Amino acid sequence: SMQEEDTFRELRIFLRNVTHRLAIDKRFRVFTKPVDPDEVPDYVTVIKQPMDLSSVISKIDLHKYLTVKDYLRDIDLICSNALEYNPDRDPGDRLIRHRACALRDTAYAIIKEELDEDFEQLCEEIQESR
Ligand SMILES: OCCn1cc(Br)cn1
Ligand SMILES: OCCn1cc(Br)cn1
Ligand SMILES: [Cl-]
């Protein structure tokens, strides 16, 4: 229905604003663009499902997220990819892990404070109806 399309549009506007807020944070700059294979030719080898905030915007705009849970799965990938690719005790790896945990925690904290639980529940029910 048109009302269901309006609901999904509101979801995309919300997710684009959350993603923009993460992308303008200087801590998260490394997560804004895909990994350049020139710099890291082993990246695409080790990390099966690369994810970054530019890819998330592209997915919102392709109507790939029908619930906030589906969006948080891609935020969780950004975090888990960084924990897996940079697991060493050296400061460069620890800094990337801490920034990735902080992205993830920030996204969840914005959604806890600003997502209406009944809005998420409605999206879930439309999705499950398709
Ligand atoms: O540092 C542990 C927190 N964490 C986030 C993901 Br995604 C998996 N674990
Ligand atoms: O392991 C993810 C969380 N973390 C904290 C520091 Br400090 C570095 N990583
Ligand atoms: Cl830096």
Side-chain angles (χ1 to χ4, degrees):
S1 77
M2 192 151 292
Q3 310 90 72
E4 291 176 341
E5 285 322 304
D6 285 354
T7 298
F8 287 134
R9 186 156 180 269
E10 176 162 3
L11 173 65
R12 290 192 300 270
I13 294 164
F14 175 75
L15 296 178
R16 282 196 200 89
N17 176 260
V18 175
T19 307
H20 179 249
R21 287 156 66 190
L22 297 172
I24 66 178
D25 191 310
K26 289 196 214 145
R27 292 175 288 173
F28 309 148
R29 192 191 169 86
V30 62
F31 306 119
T32 54
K33 276 263 162 287
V35 169
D36 177 23
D38 302 341
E39 266 54 25
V40 205
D42 72 292
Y43 190 72
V44 72
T45 285
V46 170
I47 298 298
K48 291 324 177 190
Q49 289 190 276
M51 187 60 59
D52 69 277
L53 299 170
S54 68
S55 291
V56 172
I57 296 292
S58 287
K59 296 180 61 167
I60 294 165
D61 290 346
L62 291 167
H63 304 194
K64 305 283 206 161
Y65 303 120
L66 298 195
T67 67
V68 181
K69 203 168 198 251
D70 287 349
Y71 173 87
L72 289 170
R73 282 192 246 278
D74 279 349
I75 299 300
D76 287 343
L77 252 185
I78 294 177
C79 183
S80 61
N81 290 340
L83 308 190
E84 175 179 329
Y85 194 70
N86 303 275
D88 293 347
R89 72 83 47 207
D90 67 270
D93 283 13
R94 290 174 155 165
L95 179 58
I96 294 153
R97 294 201 301 279
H98 192 266
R99 290 168 164 180
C101 287
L103 177 65
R104 175 173 147 107
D105 290 345
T106 299
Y108 276 77
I110 293 168
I111 285 159
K112 185 198 162 64
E113 280 204 303
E114 302 179 25
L115 174 56
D116 188 308
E117 293 197 319
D118 289 336
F119 182 81
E120 176 60 4
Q121 185 66 34
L122 175 60
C123 289
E124 288 184 14
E125 292 186 0
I126 308 163
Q127 170 185 59
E128 168 68 285
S129 86
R130 300 290 175 82

